[PDB]
Amino acid sequence: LRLIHAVRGYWLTNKVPIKRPS
């Protein structure tokens, strides 16, 4: 909701290799 969680979730999901096809 708030930008802090938006930007956090952004890099937090990017540092991790997304091997799952969503």
The answer on whether 22 is annotated among ligand-binding residues is: yes
Q: Find how far residue 4's CA is from the centre of its chain.
A: 12
- Report d(CA 2, CA 15) in Å as an integer: 21
- SS3 state at 11: helix
Nearest partner of 5 among 18, 21, 13, judged by Cα: 13
Q: Please tell me the distance from the alpha carbon of residue 22 to that of residue 4, in angstroms, as a whole number.
A: 23
Method: NMR
